[PDB]
């Protein structure tokens, strides 16, 4: 198992949901993109901004223990628990 558990637990969001988050707007405040983050938790669908604005992604991460956040600006995933950037595979193949 050469992968992070935090992210390995969360799923993936559809383009439909990401499209709204990619619009460049925070679900908590009104900072307006670019540079916006979105909860990677397949079960969660919240839009927050990183430390570059109000670190909403961090706060939300603690509140819901969601240490997975992906910036819609570069389409990159980040792991708070691991304390680094991670990548989300498109296809697994377990079941
Ligand atoms: Zn915000
Ligand atoms: Zn969340
Ligand atoms: Zn991790």
UniProtKB/Swiss-Prot annotation:
Zn(2+) 2 binds at residues 26, 29, 49, 56. Zn(2+) 1 binds at residues 4, 6, 79, 82. Zn(2+) 3 binds at residues 39, 44, 60, 66. Ubiquitinated via a VHL-dependent pathway for proteasomal degradation. Widely expressed. It is found in: Cytoplasm, Perinuclear region; Cytoplasm, Cytoskeleton, Microtubule organizing center, Centrosome. Deubiquitinating enzyme involved in various processes such as centrosome duplication, cellular migration and beta-2 adrenergic receptor/ADRB2 recycling. Involved in regulation of centrosome duplication by mediating deubiquitination of CCP110 in S and G2/M phase, leading to stabilize CCP110 during the period which centrioles duplicate and elongate. Involved in cell migration via its interaction with intracellular domain of ROBO1, leading to regulate the Slit signaling. The UBP-type zinc finger binds 3 zinc ions. However, it does not bind ubiquitin, probably because the conserved Arg in position 86 is replaced by a Glu residue. This is Ubiquitin carboxyl-terminal hydrolase 33. It comes from Homo sapiens (Human). The chain holds residues 36 to 130 of 942 of the full protein.
């Amino acid at each position: 198992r050469n992968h992070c558990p935090h992210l390995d637990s969360v799923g993936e969001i559809t383009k439909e949901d990401l499209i709204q988050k990619s619009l460049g707007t925070c679900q908590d405040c009104k900072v307006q993109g670019p540079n916006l983050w979105a909860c990677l938790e397949n079960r969660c669908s919240y839009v927050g901004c990183g430390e570059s604005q109000v670190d909403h992604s961090t706060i939300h991460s603690q509140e819901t223990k969601h240490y997975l956040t992906v910036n819609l600006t570069t389409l990159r995933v980040w792991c708070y628990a691991c304390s680094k950037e991670v990548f989300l595979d498109r296809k697994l193949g377990t079941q």
